[PDB]
Amino acid sequence: MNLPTAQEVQGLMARYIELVDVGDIEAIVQMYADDATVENPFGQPPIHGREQIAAFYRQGLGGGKVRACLTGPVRASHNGCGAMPFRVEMVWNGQPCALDVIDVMRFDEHGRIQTMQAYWSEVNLSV
Amino acid sequence: MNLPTAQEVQGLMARYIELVDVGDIEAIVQMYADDATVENPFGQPPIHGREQIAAFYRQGLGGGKVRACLTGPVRASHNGCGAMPFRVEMVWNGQPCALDVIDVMRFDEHGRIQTMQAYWSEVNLSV
Ligand SMILES: O=[N+]([O-])c1ccc(O)cc1F
Ligand SMILES: O=[N+]([O-])c1ccc(O)cc1F
Numbered sequence: 097m098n099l100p101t102a103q104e105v106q107g108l109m110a111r112y113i114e115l116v117d118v119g120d121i122e123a124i125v126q127m128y129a130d131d132a133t134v135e136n137p138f139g140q141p142p143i144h145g146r147e148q149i150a151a152f153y154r155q156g157l158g159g160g161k162v163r164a165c166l167t168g169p170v171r172a173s174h175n176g177c178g179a180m181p182f183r184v185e186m187v188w189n190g191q192p193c194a195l196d197v198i199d200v201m202r203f204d205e206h207g208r209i210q211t212m213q214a215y216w217s218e219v220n221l222s223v
Numbered sequence: 224m225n226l227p228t229a230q231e232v233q234g235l236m237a238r239y240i241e242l243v244d245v246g247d248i249e250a251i252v253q254m255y256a257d258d259a260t261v262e263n264p265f266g267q268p269p270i271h272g273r274e275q276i277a278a279f280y281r282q283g284l285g286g287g288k289v290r291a292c293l294t295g296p297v298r299a300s301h302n303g304c305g306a307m308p309f310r311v312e313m314v315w316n317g318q319p320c321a322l323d324v325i326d327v328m329r330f331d332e333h334g335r336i337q338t339m340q341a342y343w344s345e346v347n348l349s350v
Contacts, residue, residue, distance in 0.1 A: 102344040139300035171325045171342035173266035179325040179342040181295045181308040198298045198306040215298035215306040217229040
């Protein structure tokens, strides 16, 4: 891939959510640039690089069942960026919660995620 | 208002949509900082300041039948930012159409919008 087109961004971002839903940590990490950053939630310091990003996804998706689904269409740009709304369902203390999130991503000139920013706060959690 | 809290961001960003929906250009412009920027769509160069911003809203809201509604919750941060998904219904050449958008906003230390970025492309328009 080169810089993804708007259409390619929609496909990549939807792919990403599919990978989160099934919980394929290694497949998620490979979507990222080797030196990518993740800010989760937006407002917290970034994490840097695939090792730290893999640890992030392992922490969240490693154990119990997690589901994730788009809750509206991906909004893509013509500069390799996009934003998408989704919901993550998880068990927290035997307690089924849901978290509503919007991710903003920028992709590099190879089609990998260079930056991810996850907008949400505790008000977006529901038990 | 100081830097808005996550709850305050949710209220402001929801109010913004209510004002787009009712078509109140002056009330929208008043929500922006005097030297704010708007990037619409994200990927295009920013416009700057209340005069340019007012001209943007007036193009669309002055006389057109326009409705706008959140299509999911506002995702707020603890650093005065947020992101929200919504749909704008408008009329184009006598055709009803809908545009799916995500706005990302950063508010200043006075509770006014410092930056707005509207993610969407042609793939988000339905005629
Ligand atoms: O559950 N999260 O905090 C979460 C945040 C952003 C993501 O892109 C995926 C996720 F699972
Ligand atoms: O129709 N738009 O392009 C549009 C974009 C962003 C907005 O905050 C409002 C709008 F009506």
